RNA sequence: AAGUGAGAAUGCCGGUGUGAGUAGCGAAAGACGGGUGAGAAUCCCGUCCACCGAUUGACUAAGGUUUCCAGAGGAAGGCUCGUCCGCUCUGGGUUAGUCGGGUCCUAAGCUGAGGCCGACAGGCGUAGGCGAUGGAUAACAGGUUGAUAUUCCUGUACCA
RNA sequence: GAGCUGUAAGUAAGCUUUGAUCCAGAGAUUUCCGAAUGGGGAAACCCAGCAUGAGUUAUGUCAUGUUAUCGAUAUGUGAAUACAUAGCAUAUCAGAAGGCACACCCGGAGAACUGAAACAUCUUAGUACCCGGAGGAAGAGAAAGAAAAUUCGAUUCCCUUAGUAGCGGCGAGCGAAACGGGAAGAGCCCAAACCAACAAGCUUGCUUGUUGGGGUUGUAGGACACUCUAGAGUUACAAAGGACGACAUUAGACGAAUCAUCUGGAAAGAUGAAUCAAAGAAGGUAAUAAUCCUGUAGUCGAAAAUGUUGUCUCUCUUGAGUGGAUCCUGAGUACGACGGAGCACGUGAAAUUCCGUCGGAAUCUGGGAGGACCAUCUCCUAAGGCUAAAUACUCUCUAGUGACCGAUAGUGAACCAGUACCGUGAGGGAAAGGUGAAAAGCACCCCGGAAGGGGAGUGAAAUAGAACCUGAAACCGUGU
């Protein structure tokens, strides 16, 4: 998670953010199946738990 | 306890006139109630007291003689019996 | 009561001293100027009593 | 050093070289009061604690470096050294006659 | 070897001038007799006269925090005077079962365990908790002090 | 070592040759508030509920203690909805929280005035402030490295190379590295291979893999096999701990020896004669003291404490060639595209480092790197953790020093300082040292109600009298 610049054609710069692609899933971390915020590049394991 | 709740008695021209109506005034602590003084004067003097009246006193300023200072707050309590005698003078 | 640590029960000594102190303080109030023969040393006894009567709770009970 | 109960010769003063007896110690200001020496004719105020506060003769207290002991075995001025073999020390008169006027 | 030299920056701070014995001294109407004292147009008592008069009257609340009472003063203090004082110095003075509050209860709001949201800090919110300026709870006739009164005392009732 | 009762003194009396005022050691109690944590609350207040102690016909009142939310354990626990899963309450556990030197460190976010003689890229600058993590140091660190010269080797810090190479509206400006000379100097624990083989009360969470042994890396090394063997030393890393002394340092120790005259109110001065010296630094004393005090040179050190830790043990132990035929060697990671950032570098030919999104390898015939991409020739083994020394800063404590200040100076504060005072609040913030050697601080008489004078007295001095050392100008007066 971090920040950066948004640059125009004449090379000015304004701040922005890069946000991660978070989704919702009925999944497990600490017991009960819950609807939690995970990201599409964090689906390396199963889906329904 | 029943000894540290009683400091010194007040001896003025108003307390001397209250002796005829059987009403002794004492200087109690600033944390006791109107029931702890009834169980401290009925044991030290062993006398059945009737009623008890208390009043708070705010601190005063100071004096030019020394330097800018303050005074300690006091708590007066007028205990009146109806069969006992005096225990001071 | 300097250096008399050979005692178990002391509370009754305490109460004797406390009625002593109340009586003596209640007279200054009127007059009676022996204020250096006063209770600046009817008080310095009582802490001797209490310290031992309490270490008889700190070390024997834990 | 000096305690309370010796006799001494004063060397630096208007009355040079006079012996007497110290009475009051006064460590706090470093001063010495000596019998029959420097009667400041104390002339206090018309009080009513000090009776008819005014003239009287109490010995003014002079400085503790103008005064110096005198050797017991010789009654000449000395300094004071110290040895001990026992609990406290024993002041040795630094000129061979040792003083036991601890009293 | 240098914190090395002062007449000016509507320069900074302190002390003393000129304008000058000049401008001013900001609500009612006073007059005399007696008294006190080193000293009186100004303080104390007395008699007459006048002013406010839905108020310069009497009492609750907010606010201030011993200015309240007695005895003694060296000036400073008070827009003059002072033997006087809301000024200085000693020593004193405020009494509650029912009077106001606290305590019961809730309004607008303010905080809220789980619960959402957010770079962090931290925002928002459900039961709940707090929060009167409103609701529910029991006193009078009189006598007294240099200073307190439904509180102290006297008679008599009411609530728990 | 003979005195005592805070700075600040007197009194007013007591206390201490038994050991008083205090120089340190060490424990005890520690009212109420404050992270405040039994529940409230306008901090220093109010209302409880308990197992003990009190008393009264009881009731009432008070004193020890316990009653917070998160973590960590042995534990239950589980309505709807059978059954765990969400609730959950009585309990077990003493790890966290706040503050403060913010000076020095490490992250997250991140300005503008200003320079370019305007200004937008660029520069102020990753600076000020805000938030977190916090240590006595932190961060970095053990090669898929920098490098043609012979490559010689973990990281940081000072001196060079150098204002050089390079970057740049190729403007203002920004600005290396190899290299050599120094200070300082050790590296390891793990995974996997394998296998002896085994632990998930409803749980305290399915990705139960759960205990070993063995091993750690490039001359390509450990597994597993052809060979059989002892010391490297452990209380700065490898994993943690204390017996053992001696000594360098922090209180207190004893601490060398001067008389006489002169002037004076009093000499340390002048003068004359002496005498200690691992001490002739400095301050006090009625004037300028190496020999009158306080000390100082140096002697015990010190009922200790650690600092250099110099030292015995104690748990610290098993390693030694090869074979290289295969076993192993960290994956949505290596790498690629788009958008950005940090590197001296404006994103360029951009190599090399980070983040978001999308795609996505083969694996020791390997893989990668040599400031484009292809061959050669070198070199090194990625995708897991930890670490002393050399260095940066000072609220404070002890001992010192200065061609540093000397009361409009030096701290805002030498004394009544963050105080008088000023503001609804955040906040702003002064002025003020000096009698004498010793209060001997003017006994007494005269004028006045008193204040203040005039004599007298104390003193070396009273034009030294608390408007108290010296007393300059501006200004105000009287005589001539």
From TrEMBL, chain A:
<dbReference type="GO" id="GO:1990904">
    <property type="term" value="C:ribonucleoprotein complex"/>
</dbReference>
<protein>
    <recommendedName>
        <fullName>Large ribosomal subunit protein bL28</fullName>
    </recommendedName>
</protein>
<keyword id="KW-0687">Ribonucleoprotein</keyword>
<dbReference type="GO" id="GO:0006412">
    <property type="term" value="P:translation"/>
</dbReference>
<comment type="similarity">
    <text>Belongs to the bacterial ribosomal protein bL28 family.</text>
</comment>
<dbReference type="GO" id="GO:0005840">
    <property type="term" value="C:ribosome"/>
</dbReference>
<dbReference type="GO" id="GO:0003735">
    <property type="term" value="F:structural constituent of ribosome"/>
</dbReference>
<keyword id="KW-0689">Ribosomal protein</keyword>
TrEMBL record, chain B:
<dbReference type="GO" id="GO:0006412">
    <property type="term" value="P:translation"/>
</dbReference>
<dbReference type="InterPro" id="IPR013025">
    <property type="entry name" value="Ribosomal_uL23-like"/>
</dbReference>
<keyword id="KW-0694">RNA-binding</keyword>
<dbReference type="GO" id="GO:0019843">
    <property type="term" value="F:rRNA binding"/>
</dbReference>
<comment type="function">
    <text>One of the early assembly proteins it binds 23S rRNA. One of the proteins that surrounds the polypeptide exit tunnel on the outside of the ribosome. Forms the main docking site for trigger factor binding to the ribosome.</text>
</comment>
<dbReference type="InterPro" id="IPR012678">
    <property type="entry name" value="Ribosomal_uL23/eL15/eS24_sf"/>
</dbReference>
<comment type="subunit">
    <text>Part of the 50S ribosomal subunit. Contacts protein L29, and trigger factor when it is bound to the ribosome.</text>
</comment>
<dbReference type="GO" id="GO:1990904">
    <property type="term" value="C:ribonucleoprotein complex"/>
</dbReference>
<protein>
    <recommendedName>
        <fullName>Large ribosomal subunit protein uL23</fullName>
    </recommendedName>
</protein>
<dbReference type="InterPro" id="IPR012677">
    <property type="entry name" value="Nucleotide-bd_a/b_plait_sf"/>
</dbReference>
<keyword id="KW-0699">rRNA-binding</keyword>
<dbReference type="GO" id="GO:0003735">
    <property type="term" value="F:structural constituent of ribosome"/>
</dbReference>
Automatic annotation (TrEMBL), chain C:
<dbReference type="InterPro" id="IPR001854">
    <property type="entry name" value="Ribosomal_uL29"/>
</dbReference>
<keyword id="KW-0689">Ribosomal protein</keyword>
<dbReference type="GO" id="GO:0022625">
    <property type="term" value="C:cytosolic large ribosomal subunit"/>
</dbReference>
<protein>
    <recommendedName>
        <fullName>Large ribosomal subunit protein uL29</fullName>
    </recommendedName>
</protein>
<dbReference type="GO" id="GO:0006412">
    <property type="term" value="P:translation"/>
</dbReference>
<dbReference type="Pfam" id="PF00831">
    <property type="entry name" value="Ribosomal_L29"/>
</dbReference>
<dbReference type="InterPro" id="IPR036049">
    <property type="entry name" value="Ribosomal_uL29_sf"/>
</dbReference>
<dbReference type="GO" id="GO:0003735">
    <property type="term" value="F:structural constituent of ribosome"/>
</dbReference>
<comment type="similarity">
    <text>Belongs to the universal ribosomal protein uL29 family.</text>
</comment>
<keyword id="KW-0687">Ribonucleoprotein</keyword>
<dbReference type="InterPro" id="IPR050063">
    <property type="entry name" value="Ribosomal_protein_uL29"/>
</dbReference>
TrEMBL record, chain D:
<dbReference type="InterPro" id="IPR041988">
    <property type="entry name" value="Ribosomal_uL24_KOW"/>
</dbReference>
<keyword id="KW-0687">Ribonucleoprotein</keyword>
<dbReference type="InterPro" id="IPR014722">
    <property type="entry name" value="Rib_uL2_dom2"/>
</dbReference>
<dbReference type="GO" id="GO:0005840">
    <property type="term" value="C:ribosome"/>
</dbReference>
<keyword id="KW-0699">rRNA-binding</keyword>
<dbReference type="Pfam" id="PF00467">
    <property type="entry name" value="KOW"/>
</dbReference>
<comment type="function">
    <text>One of two assembly initiator proteins, it binds directly to the 5'-end of the 23S rRNA, where it nucleates assembly of the 50S subunit.</text>
</comment>
<comment type="subunit">
    <text>Part of the 50S ribosomal subunit.</text>
</comment>
<dbReference type="InterPro" id="IPR005824">
    <property type="entry name" value="KOW"/>
</dbReference>
<dbReference type="InterPro" id="IPR005825">
    <property type="entry name" value="Ribosomal_uL24_CS"/>
</dbReference>
<dbReference type="GO" id="GO:1990904">
    <property type="term" value="C:ribonucleoprotein complex"/>
</dbReference>
<dbReference type="GO" id="GO:0019843">
    <property type="term" value="F:rRNA binding"/>
</dbReference>
